[PDB]
């Protein structure tokens, strides 16, 4: 699935992510925009034998695993493939893991370089939420 | 198959320093995210604060500074640190993982003169 | 920090009879809700996660639902097995704070 902006938010919203610990929903909405073009599919492998997955990029080092990667730690306890789904309740709950260690949202990059300290409401302004 | 036990004394004086461990045992530790949950005599628990991967700490105000919790990943266990210890700090200790998928036995202790 | 108020204090319930347990919580804190159960003599287990996700291998008795404010646990066609004591936790916002409890009590 491909999320239409508006969609995505109100699904995260519906995920209770809106100020999830400090930060506004426009976050989410935005790091997911540039970090997979709200693709639940997108999957970039990293030089480093590792591989992404799903709307957050959640990375194959520290949070799932796919199998393909040995140093592995499983921090999120969920198989990677979970995290290609329709379904983000998995994306979402690891998110709301990773997101809590004081490198909160940096750990999300594109976040960090693109999205980060924009009026982020935009992302979240003219939805049905 | 993941097992947490918490332990260390059982009694320290007022204004002293009381420390405990949480050997864990069977699972990793390496980065999971670790913590402290006290529960008081009236039955109503208190988290205390935690160890995400990092070694990034969050703790509750309500305990003012006076901890310090920490870990050990050769000796693969973590601890903690009350420090001024005082007689409210009468409770039972656990150690938890980020949500509270697993716990510990608990251990009691005693702040008393 | 934040309040969780949970309601009723206690509950004698026969078994077989359906229950349910409130926790309010002073803040919008959208669905981080989590229940816990805490048996006679032992540390507490997680039941339901964020709001109505059940943890595995817990009774399909147990249901959550909420999100906002008011937040509801459901033990379905109780059992004896169910009398403990049941608090809520949000992990919205630092400091995470339990609820009051609530005592389950099984009328024999």
């Known amino acids: 699935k491909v999320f239409g902006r508006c969609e995505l938010a109100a699904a995260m919203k519906r995920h209770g992510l809106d100020n999830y610990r400090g930060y506004s929903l426009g976050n989410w909405v935005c790091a997911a925009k540039f970090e997979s073009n709200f693709n639940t599919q997108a999957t970039n492998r990293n030089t480093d034998g590792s591989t992404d997955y799903g709307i957050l990029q959640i990375n194959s080092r520290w949070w799932c695993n796919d199998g393909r990667t040995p140093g592995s730690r499983n921090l999120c306890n969920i198989p990677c493939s979970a995290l290609l789904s329709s379904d983000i309740t998995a994306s979402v709950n690891c998110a709301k893991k990773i997101v809590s260690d004081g490198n909160g949202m940096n750990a999300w990059v594109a976040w960090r370089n693109r999205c980060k300290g924009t009026d982020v409401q935009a992302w979240i302004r003219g939805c049905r939420l | 198959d993941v097992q947490l036990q918490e332990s260390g004394p059982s009694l320290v004086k007022p204004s002293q320093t009381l420390s405990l461990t949480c050997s864990v045992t069977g699972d990793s530790i390496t980065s999971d995210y670790w913590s402290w949950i006290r529960k008081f005599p009236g039955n109503r628990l208190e988290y205390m604060g935690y160890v995400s991967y990092s070694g990034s700490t969050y703790y509750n105000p309500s305990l003012k500074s006076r901890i310090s919790i920490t870990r050990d990943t050769s000796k693969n266990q973590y601890y903690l640190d009350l420090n001024s210890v005082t007689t409210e700090d009468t409770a039972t200790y656990y150690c938890?993982?980020?949500?509270?998928?697993?716990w510990g036995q608990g251990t009691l202790v005693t702040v008393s003169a | 920090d934040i309040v969780l108020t949970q309601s009723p204090a206690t509950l004698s319930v026969t078994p077989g009879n359906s229950v349910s347990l409130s926790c309010r919580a002073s803040?919008?804190?959208?669905?981080?809700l989590h229940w816990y159960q805490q048996k006679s003599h032992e540390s507490p287990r997680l039941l339901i996660k964020?709001?109505?996700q059940s943890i595995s291998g817990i009774p399909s008795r147990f249901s959550g639902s909420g999100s906002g404010t008011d937040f509801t646990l459901s033990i379905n066609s109780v059992e004896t097995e169910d009398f403990g004591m049941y608090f809520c936790q949000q992990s919205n916002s630092w400091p995470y704070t339990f609820g009051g409890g609530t005592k389950l009590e099984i009328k024999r």
């Open positions: 803040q919008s804190i959208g669905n981080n």
């Open positions: 938890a993982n980020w949500d509270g998928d697993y």
């Open positions: 964020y709001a109505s």
